Every structure is written in structure tokens, then in C-alpha cells.
Symmetry: C2
Subunit: 360 residues, 2 copies
Amino acid sequence: QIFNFSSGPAMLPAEVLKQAQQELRDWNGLGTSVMEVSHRGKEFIQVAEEAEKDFRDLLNVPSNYKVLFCHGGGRGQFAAVPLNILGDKTTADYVDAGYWAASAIKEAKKYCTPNVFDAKVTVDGLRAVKPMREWQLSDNAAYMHYCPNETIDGIAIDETPDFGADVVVAADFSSTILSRPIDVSRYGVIYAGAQKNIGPAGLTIVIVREDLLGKANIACPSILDYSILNDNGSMFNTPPTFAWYLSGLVFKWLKANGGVAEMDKINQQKAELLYGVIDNSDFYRNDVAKRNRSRMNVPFQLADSALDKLFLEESFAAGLHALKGHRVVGGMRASIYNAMPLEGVKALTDFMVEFERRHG
Amino acid sequence: QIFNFSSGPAMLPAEVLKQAQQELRDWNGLGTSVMEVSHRGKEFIQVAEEAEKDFRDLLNVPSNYKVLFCHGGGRGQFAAVPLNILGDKTTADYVDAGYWAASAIKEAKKYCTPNVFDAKVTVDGLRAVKPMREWQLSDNAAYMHYCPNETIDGIAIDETPDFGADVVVAADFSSTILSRPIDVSRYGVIYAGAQKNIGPAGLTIVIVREDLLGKANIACPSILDYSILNDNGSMFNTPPTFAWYLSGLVFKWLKANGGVAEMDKINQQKAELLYGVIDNSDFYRNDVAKRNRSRMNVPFQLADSALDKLFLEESFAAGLHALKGHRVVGGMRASIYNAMPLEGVKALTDFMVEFERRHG
């Protein structure tokens, strides 16, 4: 009855929350919560090992990659990436195609001189991104950073990186990881805040290629040092245990429902249904090129913005929450992450048609 | 029936967990969990403002102090303190009286050359700490750092700092904050990982004197920068929302039960009961000077270590969990935090007498 379209923190699988709620005070017949046990006890160590295993199976992460669970969120990584894989070099390439990509560039300036490449273009009045083959990388860059999914702009770069063996790719997968199959071997570093497709806020997952370890700056706090996290099994210090446990339930939920392949198909239908309604309407509009349309974050605008308030009041009353767009861009936005069922996207589109019919 | 003596993550107030469980899937009649709503939505912003307010009331934090909620845990602050309040100076005084105090010194070496002061002394064969009047601070130091409660050693420095107005005191209150009343105005920085007395793991609370802001190192990751956190109301990036909400329930639980003054009184009864049993027995022994005995972490050894395993087997069977001491020190350890009721400490002591009477 209630469908939550929050952009992050976002909706978690209903099934997962039922289990967490039921075991909140007595987990594993221990008579205590997962939140009350030591992270060094065998009970939690097993939960942490299962979670990493399930995640590796879900995305087919090769053996030469380390999977780390840490504090800091996505913005913590804006600093952790340069602090870890910059080495003795003083420049890195940063591709800008949205808010998050730009925010990463801002943080990077504290550690190096980033060579920025603006990939934004407007083709046919629609917002698109230049193909990777046109991206200009520099000769002595330590790595190249980009964001494949911009939550505010509703822009996605699905293209698989294919640069030389000489190029290290770092990417912010916070709002799109686990939504479709990806080739991890093409990347050097993949990071993602958990609060959108993985679990609750407070945990971050990082996938690092082995050979990139060992060259962290001495100024890097130990909690953000990939080498230290790796050496200690992401347990250098007390990790966010409840968040790690919930993320583990989500991975099991994904596996039980067909993995990333099935998730990809359902996400395709969800997106097609929504963009179809928007495109066929004179009342709603999305200005992103088809090739770069995000299936996770769908921003749109009403032809008559004077109806914004009424759209939000009625939508909320119909049980459709968090449809207001980001503070910086205005308009509306429906975030339809993995946890969001097709029936939820259908309830939204049904309301959109009815609203256009009554006030359009 | 089951009492959890885990040192951190630790037991949370039973009443707090009952509430969190009931509202896990439908918080505030929103039809969603606290974990699924935006941190920028009016609802969560209110939870965050009350948590801060309640905390300020509990410890009587003056207006010239900022209360920040951040990622990283206690070990994240071992780096954050130097990165934030070192300024132009290249040295800081560090008082060493236990494991945590020493760990802080190790991290501080990445940012400055710390002047270490060993405050450990053995008086009458019992482990004690030198009075603060005997601590040797340096002229050139940016600040002085110490840890008032060592969880592994069971050592506590309750003495109130009273150095010049030109000495900035930074302290690690992770395992003792909210257990007794303190004079916040005597400190420059007070930090504490939440997993011991405040809430679940994944959240850290920092109390900073305002004039200490504005001089962070440029290498400090923005998520650890006190100025940035302050400017953005601890919401520069997505915070660990569930942990912040649970911490808020804990503060309300404390207020409902008499605040820090009542908590101090119950903690006195708990510690006296336990240390009394240990001191009156030849079978159990604690080697810490009375003046430095922690009321939160009570480590003890059996006279016959060959009974260690049987002590743990039987104690666990009697519903007394996590009594094993830290790997580094061996022996046993009962962590009796705010959430631990007197009845829980009584159940333990009853078992200890019965075990000695049966195998002693």
C-alpha cells in the first residue's frame, strides 16, 4: 500500500526487514541482538564471511580483487581513492558528467591536481554523455575516475570501460551497483555507499584490485587505508555490524530471486513502464537522452510547475512517498532501486495518468 | 535470563530494543522504517535535532561547544584529532596508561611527533596511574591527549583536568561517557564511539570547543573535518541514520530514568558489588589500584587458570555471556555498562560465589 521512492536512504526488501525485525532481540538463538555481540565472536565473523562470499558470487568478482567493508559512505571514498592509489604521482583524470562526479573532483583537489574532462553534451535538446572513446586521458595520471550513475540528473553511463592495461579505472557505483551485470575485471576500484542498493546507511563496499594495494599515503587515516582494512579482514576497528548483517540478508535475498541477471530484467521493465508514461504524456517530461537514461533514478518535470505542490499532496495521499526532486534541480524524481517492485512502479504510473487526466 | 557482558558492541537498554523492534517497519506512522527515509526529510531532521539536544542536556554541554555525529568509530578519531586541531604546530602531548591510549599514539605518528608520557605506575603491586599534577606537558604542544577509561586493563582516570587555559585537552571517552557527570568546560575535544554506552556501532560522537575549529589540515578527508561537519549539521554526507535514531532513544531512556546522576549511582552499586566479591575471594583476583578501578570494565583472573574453560562453559550455561578477557591479556572480564542492570551484576556474582564454592 505504501511505496517509498526515497533516493537514499532508500527502500529495503520487505522480506529482509521482516526477518531483521523478528530477530532484533534474539538472533541465532543467542538471546541477544546482532547489535549486541562482539565483531570478533565466531557468530558475527561467520556473518561477515558469508556476506563477502555472497557479494562475490553475485557480481562474479575475480580472485585478484579484495572486497572491503568500511565506514565513511561514498564521500569518504572521494578522499580514500586519492589517498590510496595515487602513489608518487600528482595527477589523476576525472570525468565530469554530473553532481557526484563533480563532488569527487572537489575532494580530489585536497590531494592532487585533477585533470578534469567535461563529458556533458546536449544532443537534440536532450542531455547526453560523450562516448568513452572520446574521453581524453592524460599520460601520467595515477588513475581515471568517473561516476556511472548520477542520482540527481538521472544520467547513466552503462558503457563498459576498455582503456589500456596502463589505465586504472576508479568508479562510484553507489546508486547502480547490483542492478545489472558488470565486468569487474575492467576496473581498478569500485566503491559504493550501501544506502541505495545494498543495505542501510553507515556501510561502504570497496572492490580493489590486489596490485593497487601497498602504496597508500602516510597521511591516510588507518580506517580508510585499503591495505590495513585488507590485512584485518575489514575489522581493523569495530565495523558497523548491524549494517553489515542487513547487507548480508539483502545479498541472500538477491540470490534467492535469481541474482543480478533477474534483477536486471525486472529493472528493465520498471524503467520502460515509467519512461513510457513520461514520453507519451504532454504533461510530464524528462530531458535525458535515451542512451543515458538511468533506470535507478528517474527525474521528471510537470509542464505546469504551479501544480507541483498539488502533485506532491495527492501522490502522498495515494501512498506514494518521496517523489520530490533534489533541492538543487527542483521538479520530481522517482528512485526505483532493486527493492522497488514492479507493482510499485505501476502504482506510480497509474497515479500519474489519473493526475494528468484530472488536472492536465 | 540472559545477561550479555560483551565489551563493545555491547548490550543496549532492553526497553530501547523493544521500541526499535516494534517500529522497525512502520516508524512514525510513515509506513516505512527509519532506515528507509531520507536524512534530509523533515522527519529524520527532527530525530537528529532531538538526539543532539537530549545529549547536551544529559551532560550539560555549554553553548560554546559543538556536538558532531560522524563515521569512523574511535580509531577514526585517533586520526581526526591531529588532522583537525594540530594547526601550525608539529607536536602534541600524549599520556599513555593503557592499550587505547597507546593506539592513539601510534596513529598520531602519521601526523606529528608526539611527546609521550608514561603514566603507568605499580603501587603496592597494584596497577595505578600517576596523578595529573605529575604529568609532564611540553611548551610547544598543540594539545594533550589521554584516555580516561581503558577497556582492556580495567583502568580509569576519574580525575578532572585542571591545566592552564592554554592547554587543550583531547580525550577518548568511548567506554565511559554518560556513566558519570563530567565538566565538559575543562576539555577541548571529547570523542566516543557509540558501541559501548551510547548506541550501536557505526556512529561516533564528538564534542568540540568552537574556537578550535577552522584550522584543519588540508589533507583531512571532509567527512572527518569538524568544520565541515559543523557547517552541515553533521550531514555533509549521508549519516548512519539508524544508529543516530537508536542513540536518540538511548538518550530519552537515560532522561526517563534520572539522567547521568542516577546512572552514576547505579553504576556505583554495580561496581561495588562485583569488586567486593573479587576482593573477598582468594579464587578471583583483580590487580588494579582501588583509585584507578574502572566501573565499566572489570577484568579478573582465576587463581587456577586450568579452570578457565570450565568457568566459561558453566557461566555461559547459566546465561552469562561474553565473560572471556581480551586476547592480549587473557583472564576474564565483565563489562558492566549503563544498560547492564544491577540484577545482571548480581546474577554474575551469585554464579561466581557458587563456582568458587564448587571448584575452589
